[PDB]
Coordinates of N, CA and C in Angstrom, one line a residue:
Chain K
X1 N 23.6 -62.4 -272.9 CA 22.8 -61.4 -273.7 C 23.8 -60.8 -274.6
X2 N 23.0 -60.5 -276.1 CA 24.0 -59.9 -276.4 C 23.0 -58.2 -276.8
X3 N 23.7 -57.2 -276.8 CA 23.1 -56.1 -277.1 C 23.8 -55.4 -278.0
X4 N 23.2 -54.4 -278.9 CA 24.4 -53.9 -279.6 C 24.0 -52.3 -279.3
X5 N 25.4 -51.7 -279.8 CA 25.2 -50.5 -279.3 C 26.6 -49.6 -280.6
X6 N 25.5 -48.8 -281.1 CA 25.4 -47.9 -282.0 C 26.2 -46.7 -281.5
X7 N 26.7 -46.2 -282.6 CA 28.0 -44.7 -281.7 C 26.6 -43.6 -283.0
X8 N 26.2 -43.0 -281.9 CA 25.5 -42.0 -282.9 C 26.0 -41.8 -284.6
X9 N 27.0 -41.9 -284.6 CA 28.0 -41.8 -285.4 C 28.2 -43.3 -286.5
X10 N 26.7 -43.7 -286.8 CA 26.8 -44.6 -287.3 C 26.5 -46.2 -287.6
X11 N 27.6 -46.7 -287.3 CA 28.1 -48.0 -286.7 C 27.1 -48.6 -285.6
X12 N 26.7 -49.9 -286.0 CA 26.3 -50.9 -284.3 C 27.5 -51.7 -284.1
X13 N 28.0 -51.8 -283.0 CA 29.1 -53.0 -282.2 C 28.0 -54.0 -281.3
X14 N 28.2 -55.2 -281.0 CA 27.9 -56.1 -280.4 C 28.4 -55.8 -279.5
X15 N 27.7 -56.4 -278.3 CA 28.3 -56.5 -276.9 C 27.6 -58.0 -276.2
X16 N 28.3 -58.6 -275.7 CA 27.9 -59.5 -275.5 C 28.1 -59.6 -273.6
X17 N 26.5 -59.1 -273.3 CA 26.7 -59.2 -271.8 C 25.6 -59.8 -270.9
X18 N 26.0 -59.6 -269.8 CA 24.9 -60.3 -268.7 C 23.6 -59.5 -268.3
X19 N 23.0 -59.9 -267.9 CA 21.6 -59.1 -267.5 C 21.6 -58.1 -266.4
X20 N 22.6 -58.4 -265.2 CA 23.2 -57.8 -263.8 C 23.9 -57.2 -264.2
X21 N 24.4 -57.2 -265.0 CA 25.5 -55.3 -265.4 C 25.1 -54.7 -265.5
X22 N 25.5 -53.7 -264.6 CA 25.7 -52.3 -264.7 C 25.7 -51.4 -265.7
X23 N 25.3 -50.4 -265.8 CA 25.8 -49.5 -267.1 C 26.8 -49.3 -267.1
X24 N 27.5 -48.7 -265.6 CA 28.6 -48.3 -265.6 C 29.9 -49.4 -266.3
X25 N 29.6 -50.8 -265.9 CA 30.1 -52.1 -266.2 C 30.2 -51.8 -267.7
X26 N 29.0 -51.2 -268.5 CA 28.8 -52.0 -269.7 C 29.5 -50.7 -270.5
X27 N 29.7 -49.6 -269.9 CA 30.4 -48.5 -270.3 C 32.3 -48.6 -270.5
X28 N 32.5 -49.1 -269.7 CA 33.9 -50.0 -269.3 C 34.0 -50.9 -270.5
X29 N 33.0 -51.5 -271.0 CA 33.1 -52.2 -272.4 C 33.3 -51.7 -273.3
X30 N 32.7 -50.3 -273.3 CA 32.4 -50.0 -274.6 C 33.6 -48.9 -274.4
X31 N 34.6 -49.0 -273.5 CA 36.0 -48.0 -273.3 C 36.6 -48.9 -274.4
X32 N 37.0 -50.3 -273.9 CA 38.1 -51.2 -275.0 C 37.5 -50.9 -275.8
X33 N 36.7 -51.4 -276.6 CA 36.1 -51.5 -277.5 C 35.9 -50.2 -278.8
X34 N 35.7 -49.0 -278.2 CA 35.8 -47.4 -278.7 C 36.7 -46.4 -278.7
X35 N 37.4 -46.7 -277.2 CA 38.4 -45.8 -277.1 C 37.9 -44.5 -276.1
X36 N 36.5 -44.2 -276.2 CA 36.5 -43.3 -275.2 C 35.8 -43.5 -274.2
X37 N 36.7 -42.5 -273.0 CA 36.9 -43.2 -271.1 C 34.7 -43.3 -271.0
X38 N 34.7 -43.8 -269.7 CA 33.7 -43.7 -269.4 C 33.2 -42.2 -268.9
X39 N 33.6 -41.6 -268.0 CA 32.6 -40.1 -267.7 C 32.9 -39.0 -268.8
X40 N 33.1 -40.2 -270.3 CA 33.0 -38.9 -271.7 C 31.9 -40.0 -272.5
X41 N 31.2 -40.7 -272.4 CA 30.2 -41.3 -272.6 C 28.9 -41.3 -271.6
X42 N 27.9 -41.0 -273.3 CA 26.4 -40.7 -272.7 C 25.6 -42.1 -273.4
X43 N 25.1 -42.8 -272.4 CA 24.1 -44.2 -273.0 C 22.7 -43.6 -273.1
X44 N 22.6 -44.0 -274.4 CA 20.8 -43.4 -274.3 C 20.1 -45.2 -274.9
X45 N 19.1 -45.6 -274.3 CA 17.8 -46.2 -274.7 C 16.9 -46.0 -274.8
X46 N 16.2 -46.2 -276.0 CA 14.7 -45.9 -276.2 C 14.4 -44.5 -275.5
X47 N 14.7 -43.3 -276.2 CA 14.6 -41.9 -275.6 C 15.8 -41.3 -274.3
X48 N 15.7 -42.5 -273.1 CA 16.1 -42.1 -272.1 C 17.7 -42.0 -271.8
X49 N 18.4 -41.6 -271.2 CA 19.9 -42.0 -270.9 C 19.7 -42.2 -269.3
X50 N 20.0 -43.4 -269.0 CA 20.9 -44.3 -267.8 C 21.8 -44.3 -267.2
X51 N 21.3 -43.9 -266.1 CA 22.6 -43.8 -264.9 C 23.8 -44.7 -264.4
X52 N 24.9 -45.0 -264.6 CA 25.4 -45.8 -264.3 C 25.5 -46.7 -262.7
X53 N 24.8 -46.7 -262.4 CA 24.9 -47.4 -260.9 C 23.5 -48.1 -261.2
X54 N 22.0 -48.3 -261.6 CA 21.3 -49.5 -262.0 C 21.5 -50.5 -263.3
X55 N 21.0 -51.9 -263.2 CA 21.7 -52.6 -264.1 C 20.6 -52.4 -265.8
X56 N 21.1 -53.5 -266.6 CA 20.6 -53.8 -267.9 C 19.2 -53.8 -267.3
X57 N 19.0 -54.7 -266.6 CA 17.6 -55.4 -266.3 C 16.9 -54.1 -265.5
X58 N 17.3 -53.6 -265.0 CA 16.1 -52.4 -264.1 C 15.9 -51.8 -265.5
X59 N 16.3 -51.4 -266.3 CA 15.6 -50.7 -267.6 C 14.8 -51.8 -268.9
X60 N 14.6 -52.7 -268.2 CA 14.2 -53.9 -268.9 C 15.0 -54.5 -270.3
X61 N 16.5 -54.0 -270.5 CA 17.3 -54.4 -271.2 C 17.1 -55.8 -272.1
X62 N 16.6 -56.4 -272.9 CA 16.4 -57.3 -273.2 C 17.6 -57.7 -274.4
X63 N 17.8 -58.9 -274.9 CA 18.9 -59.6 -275.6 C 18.4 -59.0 -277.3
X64 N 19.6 -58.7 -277.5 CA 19.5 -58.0 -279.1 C 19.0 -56.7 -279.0
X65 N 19.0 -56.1 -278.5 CA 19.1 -54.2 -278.2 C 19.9 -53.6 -278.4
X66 N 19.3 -52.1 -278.7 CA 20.6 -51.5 -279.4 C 20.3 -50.2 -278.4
X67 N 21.7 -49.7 -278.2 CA 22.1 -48.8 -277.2 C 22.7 -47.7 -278.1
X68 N 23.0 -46.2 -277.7 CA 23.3 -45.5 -278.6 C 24.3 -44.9 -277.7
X69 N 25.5 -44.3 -278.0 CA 26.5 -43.7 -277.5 C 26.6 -42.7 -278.1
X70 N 26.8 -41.7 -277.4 CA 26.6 -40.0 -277.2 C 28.2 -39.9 -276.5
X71 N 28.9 -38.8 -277.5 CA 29.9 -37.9 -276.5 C 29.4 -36.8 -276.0
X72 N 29.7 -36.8 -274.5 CA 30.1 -35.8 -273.9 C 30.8 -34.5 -273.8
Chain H
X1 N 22.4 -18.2 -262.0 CA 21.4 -17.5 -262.2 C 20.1 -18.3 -261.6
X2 N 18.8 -17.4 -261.2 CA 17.9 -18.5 -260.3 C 16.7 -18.6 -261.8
X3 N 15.9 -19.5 -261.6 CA 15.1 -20.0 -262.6 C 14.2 -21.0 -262.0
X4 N 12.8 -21.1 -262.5 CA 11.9 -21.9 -261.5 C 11.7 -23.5 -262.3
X5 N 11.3 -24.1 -261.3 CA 11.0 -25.4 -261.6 C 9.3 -25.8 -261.0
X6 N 8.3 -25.9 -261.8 CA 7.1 -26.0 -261.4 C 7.2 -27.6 -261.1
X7 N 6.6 -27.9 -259.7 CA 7.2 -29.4 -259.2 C 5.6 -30.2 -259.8
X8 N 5.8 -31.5 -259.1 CA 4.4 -32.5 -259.4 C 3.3 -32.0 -258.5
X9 N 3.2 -31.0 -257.9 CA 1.8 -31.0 -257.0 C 2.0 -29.6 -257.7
X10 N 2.1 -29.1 -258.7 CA 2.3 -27.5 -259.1 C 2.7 -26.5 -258.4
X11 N 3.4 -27.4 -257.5 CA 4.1 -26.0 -256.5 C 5.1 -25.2 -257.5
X12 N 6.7 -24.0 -256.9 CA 7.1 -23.7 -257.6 C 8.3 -23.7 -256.6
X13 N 9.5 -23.9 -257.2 CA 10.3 -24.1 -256.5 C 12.0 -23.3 -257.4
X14 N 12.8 -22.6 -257.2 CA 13.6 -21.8 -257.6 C 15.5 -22.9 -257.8
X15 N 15.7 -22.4 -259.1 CA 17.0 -23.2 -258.6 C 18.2 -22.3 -258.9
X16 N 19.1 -22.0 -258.5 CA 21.2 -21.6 -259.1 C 21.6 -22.6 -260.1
X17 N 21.3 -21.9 -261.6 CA 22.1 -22.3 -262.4 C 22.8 -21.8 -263.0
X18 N 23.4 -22.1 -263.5 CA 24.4 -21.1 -264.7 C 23.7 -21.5 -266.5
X19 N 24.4 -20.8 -267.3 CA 23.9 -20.6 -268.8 C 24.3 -21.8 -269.1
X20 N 25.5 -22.6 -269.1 CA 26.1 -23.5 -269.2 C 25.9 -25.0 -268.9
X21 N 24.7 -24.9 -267.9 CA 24.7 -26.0 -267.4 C 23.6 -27.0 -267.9
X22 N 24.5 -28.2 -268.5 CA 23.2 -29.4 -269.2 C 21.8 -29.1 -268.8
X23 N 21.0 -30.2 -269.5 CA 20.1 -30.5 -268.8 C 20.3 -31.3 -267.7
X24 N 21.1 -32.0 -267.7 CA 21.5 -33.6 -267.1 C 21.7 -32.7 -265.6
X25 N 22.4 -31.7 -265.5 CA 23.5 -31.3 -264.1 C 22.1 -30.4 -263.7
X26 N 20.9 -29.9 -264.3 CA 19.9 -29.6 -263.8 C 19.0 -30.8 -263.1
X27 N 18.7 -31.3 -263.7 CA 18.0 -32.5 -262.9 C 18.4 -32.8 -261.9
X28 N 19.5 -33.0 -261.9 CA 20.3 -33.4 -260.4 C 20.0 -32.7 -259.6
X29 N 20.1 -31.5 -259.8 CA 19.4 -30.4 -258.5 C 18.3 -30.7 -258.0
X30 N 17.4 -31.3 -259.1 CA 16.0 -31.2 -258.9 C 15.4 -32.1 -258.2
X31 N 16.5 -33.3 -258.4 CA 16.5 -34.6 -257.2 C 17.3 -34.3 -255.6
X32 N 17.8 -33.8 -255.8 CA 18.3 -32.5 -254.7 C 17.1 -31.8 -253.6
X33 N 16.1 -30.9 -254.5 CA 15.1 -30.7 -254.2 C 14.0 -31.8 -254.3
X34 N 13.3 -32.4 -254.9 CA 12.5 -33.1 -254.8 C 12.8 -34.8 -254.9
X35 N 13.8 -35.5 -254.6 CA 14.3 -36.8 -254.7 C 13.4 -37.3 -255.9
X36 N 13.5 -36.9 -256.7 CA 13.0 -37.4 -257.8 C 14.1 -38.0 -258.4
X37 N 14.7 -39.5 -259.7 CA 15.8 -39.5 -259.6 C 15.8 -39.0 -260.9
X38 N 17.4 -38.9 -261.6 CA 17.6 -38.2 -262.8 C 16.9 -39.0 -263.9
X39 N 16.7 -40.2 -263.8 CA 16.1 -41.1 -265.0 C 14.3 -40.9 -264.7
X40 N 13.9 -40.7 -264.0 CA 12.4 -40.1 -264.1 C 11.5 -39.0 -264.3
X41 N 12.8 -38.3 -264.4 CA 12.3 -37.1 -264.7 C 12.4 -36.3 -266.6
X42 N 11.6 -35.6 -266.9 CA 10.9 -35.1 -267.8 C 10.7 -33.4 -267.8
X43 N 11.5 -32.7 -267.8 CA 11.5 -31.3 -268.0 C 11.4 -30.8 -269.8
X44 N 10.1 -29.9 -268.9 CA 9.4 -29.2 -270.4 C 9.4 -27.5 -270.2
X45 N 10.1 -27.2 -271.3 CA 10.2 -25.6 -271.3 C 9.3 -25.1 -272.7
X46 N 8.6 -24.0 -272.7 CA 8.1 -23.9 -273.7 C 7.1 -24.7 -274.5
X47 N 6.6 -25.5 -273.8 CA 5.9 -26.9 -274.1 C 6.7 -27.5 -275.0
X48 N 8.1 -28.2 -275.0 CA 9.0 -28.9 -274.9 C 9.9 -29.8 -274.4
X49 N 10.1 -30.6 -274.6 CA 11.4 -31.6 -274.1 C 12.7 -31.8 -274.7
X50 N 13.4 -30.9 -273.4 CA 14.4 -31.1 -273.3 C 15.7 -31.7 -272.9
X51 N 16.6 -32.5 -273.7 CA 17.3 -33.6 -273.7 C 18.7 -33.2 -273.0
X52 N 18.9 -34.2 -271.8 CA 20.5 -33.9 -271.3 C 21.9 -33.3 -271.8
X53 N 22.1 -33.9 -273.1 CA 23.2 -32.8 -273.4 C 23.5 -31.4 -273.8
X54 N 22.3 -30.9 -274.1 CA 22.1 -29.3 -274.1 C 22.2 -28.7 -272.8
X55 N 22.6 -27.2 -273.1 CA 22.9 -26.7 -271.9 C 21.7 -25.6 -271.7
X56 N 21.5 -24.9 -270.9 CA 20.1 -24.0 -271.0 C 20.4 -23.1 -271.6
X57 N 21.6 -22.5 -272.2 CA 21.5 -21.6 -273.2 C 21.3 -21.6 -274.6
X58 N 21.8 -23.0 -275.0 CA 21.2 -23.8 -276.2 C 19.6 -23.8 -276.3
X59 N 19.0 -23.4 -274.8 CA 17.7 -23.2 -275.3 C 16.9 -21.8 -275.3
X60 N 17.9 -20.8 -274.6 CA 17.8 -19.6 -274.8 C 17.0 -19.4 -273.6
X61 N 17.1 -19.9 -272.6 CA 17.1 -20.2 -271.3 C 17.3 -19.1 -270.4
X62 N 16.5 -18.0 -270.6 CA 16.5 -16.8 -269.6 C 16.5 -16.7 -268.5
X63 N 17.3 -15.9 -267.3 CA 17.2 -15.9 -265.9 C 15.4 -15.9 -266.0
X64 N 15.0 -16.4 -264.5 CA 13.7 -16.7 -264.4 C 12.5 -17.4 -265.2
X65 N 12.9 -18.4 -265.8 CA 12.1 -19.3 -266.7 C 11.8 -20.1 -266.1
X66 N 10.6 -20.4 -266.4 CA 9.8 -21.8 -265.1 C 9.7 -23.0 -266.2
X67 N 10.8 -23.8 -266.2 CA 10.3 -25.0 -266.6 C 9.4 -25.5 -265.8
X68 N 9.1 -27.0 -266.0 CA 8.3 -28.2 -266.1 C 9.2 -29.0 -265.5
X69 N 8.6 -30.1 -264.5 CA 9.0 -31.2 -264.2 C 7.8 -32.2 -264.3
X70 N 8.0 -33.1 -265.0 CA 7.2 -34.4 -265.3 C 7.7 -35.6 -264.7
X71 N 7.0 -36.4 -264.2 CA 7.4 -37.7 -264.0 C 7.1 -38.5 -265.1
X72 N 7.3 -39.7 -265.0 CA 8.1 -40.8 -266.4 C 7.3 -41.8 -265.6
X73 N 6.0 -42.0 -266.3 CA 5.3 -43.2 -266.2 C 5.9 -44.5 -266.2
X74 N 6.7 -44.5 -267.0 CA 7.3 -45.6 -268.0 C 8.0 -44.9 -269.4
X75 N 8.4 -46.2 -270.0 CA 9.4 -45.7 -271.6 C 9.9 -46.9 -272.2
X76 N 10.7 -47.6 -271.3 CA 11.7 -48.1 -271.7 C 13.3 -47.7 -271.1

């Protein structure tokens, strides 16, 4: 799957991941990728922000989605 | 500081928060008190919705204010 995910601040980055990841997992991505750690990152989708312990798919995550990253 | 939370059967239920604290570190209480989890819930102050990174003083969040707790039908 690939999803992309947007820094409020702009920018969309691709992410190219699985459907069984975690937030937390997909947060860990977006550390290389950005630079900042994971418990200084906020995931918001479609209105809501997601807990890191259910996956892509429990929020119905689907391929080519865009995620928004919020600092903390 | 204590401040109320009107639950899903309209009961009323009181929580310890401070001025400072998200919305996000509120909810958590509120799954605390009612196992509701933090992604289904919906708190409305002032006939509003209010989003996790704000803190209750950001909303001017006076000792004893009775928010709202909504459940989350759905969204996305």
């Amino acid at each position: 799957m690939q999803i992309f995910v947007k820094t409020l601040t702009g920018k969309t980055i691709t992410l190219e991941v699985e459907p069984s990841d975690t937030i937390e997992n997909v947060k860990a991505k977006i550390q290389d990728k950005e630079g900042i750690p994971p418990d200084q990152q906020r995931l918001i989708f479609a209105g809501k922000q997601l807990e890191d312990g259910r996956t892509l798919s429990d929020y119905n995550i689907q391929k080519e989605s865009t995620l928004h990253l919020v600092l903390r």
